[PDB]
Structure formats: structure tokens, C-alpha cells
Design a protein around this ligand. Structure first.
Ligand SMILES: [Mg+2]
Length: 476
RNA sequence: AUGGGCC
RNA sequence: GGCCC
């Protein structure tokens, strides 16, 4: 978005930290072009003359303003997508109880009991367990008073800027392109879950191309479902965004919230209001307070869902701005936040859509290599989604999610102290789809030091997971 | 080190 | 706890 004000205050919010990711035995074997993101300004790995603080907020370039006619078009697209979504999900969207918002429901998992509480709780000590009883599903006086202000629509907050401690390609580590997490206050998260929690639960349960959302999916199982769907289409596109989250303009955000979360769809009047508080935000980074207009914070409840919904409306908006007679059945798509797979039997010109996405402030580029524009004829076996390719298994005849071996090497090369064993088992479930030979090669540095699951055991587990009859058919 | 998923 | 977004 657009940075409107940068104020220096006395209170310093500690963010820097040291990386908790330590190199494993695999690091010296694979030597990946990957490493922990730069968390300190004095990190020796950083390029000369790179100020980490400036690069972080460089994503905030502008808040794109839309014309009345483009806003009118966007409203129509939001309402059209909002028609499809609530037709599939239903309109049972009344507030969740406090208990349900904390403990979760069918389709919505519970709030994490010991994550960051946000501001101003971080400046007072106080963890999440002191403010909220997670076992009993009850809130203390501090949150109670905050919830009363949100009901009154008088609630004010600040986002706490956190540096994301993660493995990144070495090019981005050296460029100081450390990702950030905007940690919202725990009460804001709770109330959002109250306002839109059942909707979110319904979204998760009904994931698929019909609603254009993969949020809630299990790639082990659903790659067959998504794979067979997109294989039916003549053209498949792999579309990359540049800073998707930060580039959501105030106009697009406000209109989407207005059209999707209407009281006539069963929502409480405050559902629209609580989401609109995400448009103009105050961010706290050390001694600096930065006011931003536009863009989506990442620590919000249902940030993935909001981004997914916007992604759906963006594609409809861009296509209607270029072509005539474009409807929801003109194409098909699945998204997860900024990640997107689009397909159509019509020879759509995504290169011509570039300016139309720009009117929203979004920059689309081909993922199909960083090549000379968008091309036609590509299939689902050519694309990546959720860092996974669509490969066929020749033992079952099903699509399986295959990650790049270079990426799996990177994941196995770094781990938090004392978590290596459980990480290996977790990564084994990802690595099984690379085939027996590659699975063997990936875990070979760990042999004799940790338990590695046999390829066979994870394969048979997966066969049953994707299709229970297929596992039984091998016994018939 | 986080929202939201999934093991 | 890990992974993806
Ligand atoms: Mg992509």
C-alpha cells in the first residue's frame, strides 16, 4: 500500500532475533542455494550497503486508485463471485460464540494457545494464555473490554511487525528480502473468527474449483481431484503475482468486503466492519510507527481466505475489462492466497490482461519460466501449485503432488534444534512422491542417526489416502 | 518467529 | 512440531 506517515516513538518493539534454524548433516552433502533469511542488520551474509529496514517496507510503493467505472465493474465481479460462493456454501453465517471461536468447529481448527498475542499485550509481558482460557473457551476482562469496543465499532489497534524466520533462496537472503508477518492483537483475531468463522469453516469444507479456493485442501488426496479437473481444459495458466498482499488497493478491498459479507448473506453487520479495519493500518517496527493505506496484513484471521477471494474477483475483473460476455463458466480456477492456476477452453490472452490487472495495482507475470510473455497450450502437468507439480503415479494411475528435489534438499538442510526427528518424518510424507530412488537419495545423509520411514510404508499409506478402494483393489 | 490450512 | 500459503 501507500505509506502516509512514519513516526518515531520512544518504545522499541524487539524484532531482530537470531535464526533458530540450524544446519543439519544434509547441508554438507547437498550444499543448497538456500539459507535462513537475514534477521539482523549486521548479518555478514548481507550484501554491502543493504539496509534491511528499508527493503522490508519497499513493498509498500503505492495505493492504486480506481475510477468510478472500474469500481462499478469490480463491484459487479465481486457480487457475481459472491453469488456463486454463497450458493455453494449456504447463508448460515451468524456469529460464532466465544467458545466456538477459540476451540474451533468442524472445518475450522482451534486458535493456537501459545502464539504471539500482539499489541499492546507484547509491551506489558502477558502471553495468550494469560488473556484467554483456551481449554475452557473463555476470555478474561482484558479481552472482554476489547470485544465490547468492537461491538461499538470504536476499537483501535496496531500491527506488530515480525521478521519471518525461514529458509530462503540465497539471492533473496543477500538482497535482504526477508518476509514479514504483521501480528494482529489476539482479540482482533478472535472477533474476526466470531464474525466470519462458520463462513471460513464452510470455505474449507467446500474447497475446489467450484468456489475457486484450495484453502483447506490436502494435496496428498486432492491432487487427483484438482489434477483430473484441469486436465479437461485446452489451456492452463500458471500466473505469478508481485507482492500480491501489499498491492491490494483500498478500493478493491472495501468493495470486496461490502459485496461478499453482506447481512443479506447471513453475516452480522460487524463482519464487514472488522474486515475494513485491515485497510488502513498502523505498524510497529522497533522505534518506528508506520501508517499504511491499503494492502492486507498477514497476521489477520482468514488472510488466506481474503486473498483467495480477491484473487478470484481479480481474474473475473481483468477478463471482463478486456473481453465481452465473460461469465464465471468462461474459465475455471483454483487459488490459495496469491498462488493460482487458471484454465479455459477459450484461447485467453493473458498478456493483454497485464494492463487490466495493473488498474488494480497488481503485476502478473508468467510462472512458466520467466519467459517472453504468456503462452497457450500448456497443461496441468506443466504448472506448479503450492510448490507442488502435478505428476502421474504409475502404480495407481493417480495424480500426486511432487516437490522439486532442490526444494526438498533445502528443507532437509535446516532444522530447529531438537525437532530434526519429527521433521524428517514430516518431510518423508512430502518426499515419497519423488519416487523410491530420489526418496533414498534425499534421506541418505540421515541414515544411521535417525529413523527414516520406509518408502513402502508411506506409499501404501498414500494409496489408501487418495483412494481407499484402490488399496483394496490391490488385494482383490 | 505468525494467520490459515493439511500430516 | 513440520510443510504450504
Ligand atoms: Mg505459480
Amino acid at each position: 500500500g501507500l505509506i502516509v506517515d512514519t513516526r518515531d516513538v520512544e518504545e522499541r518493539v524487539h524484532v531482530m532475533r537470531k535464526t533458530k534454524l540450524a544446519p543439519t548433516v544434509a547441508h554438507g552433502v547437498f550444499n543448497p542455494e538456500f539459507g535462513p533469511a537475514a534477521l539482523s542488520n549486521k548479518d555478514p551474509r548481507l550484501n554491502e550497503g543493504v539496509v534491511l529496514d528499508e527493503v522490508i517496507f519497499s513493498k509498500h510503493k503505492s495505493d492504486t486508485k480506481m475510477s468510478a467505472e472500474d469500481k462499478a465493474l469490480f463491484r459487479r465481479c465481486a457480487a457475481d463471485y459472491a453469488s456463486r460462493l454463497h450458493s455453494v456454501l449456504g447463508t448460515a453465517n451468524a456469529p460464532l460464540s466465544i467458545y466456538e471461536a477459540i476451540k474451533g468447529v468442524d472445518g475450522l481448527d482451534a486458535m493456537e494457545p501459545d502464539t504471539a498475542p500482539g499489541l499492546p499485550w507484547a509491551l506489558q509481558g502477558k502471553r495468550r494464555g494469560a488473556l484467554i482460557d483456551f481449554e475452557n473457551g473463555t476470555v478474561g476482562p482484558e479481552v472482554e473490554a476489547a470485544l465490547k469496543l468492537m461491538e461499538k465499532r470504536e476499537y483501535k489497534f496496531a500491527c506488530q511487525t515480525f521478521l519471518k524466520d525461514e529458509i530462503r533462496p540465497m539471492e533473496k537472503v543477500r538482497a535482504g528480502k526477508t518476509r514479514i508477518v504483521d501480528v494482529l492483537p489476539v482479540e482482533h483475531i478472535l472477533y474476526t473468527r466470531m464474525m466470519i468463522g462458520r463462513f471460513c469453516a464452510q470455505m474449507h469444507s467446500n474447497n475446489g474449483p467450484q468456489i475457486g479456493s484450495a484453502v483447506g485442501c490436502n494435496p496428498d488426496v486432492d491432487w487427483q481431484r484438482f489434477g483430473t479437473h484441469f486436465a479437461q481444459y485446452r489451456n492452463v495458466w500458471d500466473v505469478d503475482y508481485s507482492a500480491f498482499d501489499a498491492n491490494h488497493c483500498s478500493d478493491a478491498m472495501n468493495i470486496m468486503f461490502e459485496e461478499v459479507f453482506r447481512t443479506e448473506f447471513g453475516f452480522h453487520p460487524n463482519a464487514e466492519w472488522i474486515l475494513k479495519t485491515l485497510v488502513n493500518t498502523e505498524h510497529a517496527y522497533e522505534n518506528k510507527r508506520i501508517t499504511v493505506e491499503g494492502g492486507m496484513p498477514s497476521g489477520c484471521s482468514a488472510t488466506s481466505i481474503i486473498n483467495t477471494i480477491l484473487n478470484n474477483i481479480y481474474v473475473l475483473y481483468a477478463l471482463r475489462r478486456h473481453y465481452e460476455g465473460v461469465e464465471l463458466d468462461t474459465y475455471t480456477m483454483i487459488s490459495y492466497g496469491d498462488d493460482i492456476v487458471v484454465a479455459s477452453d477459450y484461447d485467453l490472452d493473458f498478456e493483454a490482461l497485464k494492463p487490466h490487472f495493473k488498474s488494480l495495482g497488481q503485476t502478473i507475470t508468467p510462472a512458466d519460466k520467466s519467459d517472453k510473455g504468456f503462452v497457450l497450450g500448456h497443461s496441468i502437468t506443466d504448472v506448479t501449485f503450492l510448490k507442488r507439480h502435478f505428476h502421474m503415479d504409475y502404480g495407481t494411475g493417480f495424480y500426486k503432488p511432487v516437490m522439486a528435489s532442490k526444494t526438498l534438499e533445502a528443507i532437509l538442510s535446516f532444522a530447529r534444534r531438537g525437532t530434526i526427528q519429527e521433521k524428517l518424518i514430516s518431510v518423508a510424507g512430502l518426499a515419497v512422491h519423488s519416487g523410491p530412488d530420489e526418496y533414498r537419495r534425499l534421506f541418505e545423509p540421515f541414515q544411521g542417526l535417525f529413523e527414516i520411514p520406509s518408502y513402502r510404508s508411506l506409499y501404501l499409506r498414500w494409496v489408501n489416502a487418495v483412494c481407499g478402494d484402490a488399496a483394496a483393489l490391490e488385494h482383490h
